[model samples]
Target: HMCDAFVGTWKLVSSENFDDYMKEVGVGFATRKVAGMAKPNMIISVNGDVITIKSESTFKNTEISFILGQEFDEVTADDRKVKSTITLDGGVLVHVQKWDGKSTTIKRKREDDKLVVECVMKGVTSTRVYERA
Candidate 1:
């Protein structure tokens, strides 16, 4: 029940400022361009305390599984290996990842019938909105 609001498949409807956020995360130009244009579907599932999120797109696919508040090794979509943690703050699931002394946070919250994701790296924040699918 930790992240019940996010226990469903969601399709990316729109995204804003994603390119800048990827740039701040040190993603290369070619990858950034392709990543910027790809709209991935987020599939979140939970079993007991473990939660898994799968990102599926035409360009690439990635998945992560972790227990709430526990840190684990994560190989990000851009292929950066980082230490990552997911925690429930209020009703939102907050994900934090650190690598090479740099870090990023991704906040996922349910608003109305949509799942809204906010990705922040350095000072750039990108908003990606999703609808239940």
Candidate 2:
């Protein structure tokens, strides 16, 4: 039901746990503060196997792309050569990011009025759910 609705360009209106997500990716305190205060907006364009995502805000801008079940390099977090794949598990879109010494995984699902994303790392976990703007 939400799979079709979730496919669109969404600007970030608010976040529940974004600061910690940035922290887990090794973002410094000063950067984190700026990111926290800034209105982080994002644009997601998805096709059958390809997805391009861009985040633009007053603080910084980031872009990433990947194909379904296909590995690709992902920036942000470390700018390392990451192997990532997006798989559908039930109603959730699960992304597994590997390389750069560790593997980080994030899952997102459309829950009513919000796109709830759950990011899991070694010790740090973040639930930076986004509300459509």
Candidate 3:
């Protein structure tokens, strides 16, 4: 399964446009500044039908657990209470979150020896790249 490619610890390597993305998502100035400076390690694991993703960093740590195609209530790192769903689309894992009629999409896909995360809100897009650790 394509999930095999995502089952490991990945360390952040680079990020682009994350500050603007955070602003678009309504994160505050101080939070955005700290978050912009933080480089978190992402840990992904699966057991049975449940998948878990944990992000660890000095600034903040957060985790989410879900089954593919199931909708769940999620409190984002930026403190947004959102309705979230994750689905597998071909080789990509697509995550969508909605709150107060606003929504965002995050896509995770394996690329060679790295994991690429694309975050989208309205017309803005951000990219964060991670490498196997």
Query: Which 10 successive residues of model 2 have the least lDDT summed?
Result: 1-10
lDDT of 3 by residue, 25-95 (tens): 99999999988888899999999899999999978888999999999988777778899999999989999
lDDT by residue (tens digit), candidate 2, 1-133: 2257566665656566677777777668887787677666667777765677787778777787776677777766333567778877887889887775777888878888777778887777777767766
Q: Where does candidate 3 have its weakest 10-residue lDDT segment? A: 72-81
TM-score of each: 0.97, 0.78, 0.97
What tens-digit string does per-residue lDDT give for candidate 1 at 82-103? Answer: 9999998988999999999999
lDDT of 1 at 57: 96
- True-vs-predicted CA distance for residue 6, candidate 2, Å: 1.7
Q: List the residue pairs that clash in candidate 2.
A: none
Clashes of 2: 0
Q: Tell me, by lDDT, which candidate is best.
A: 3
Candidate 3 positional error at 16, Å: 0.4
The alpha-carbon lDDT assigned to residue 43 of candidate 3 equals 96
lDDT of candidates 1 onward, in order: 0.92, 0.71, 0.93
Decreasing lDDT order of the candidates:
3, 1, 2
Name the candidate, 2 or 3, with the larger lDDT value: 3
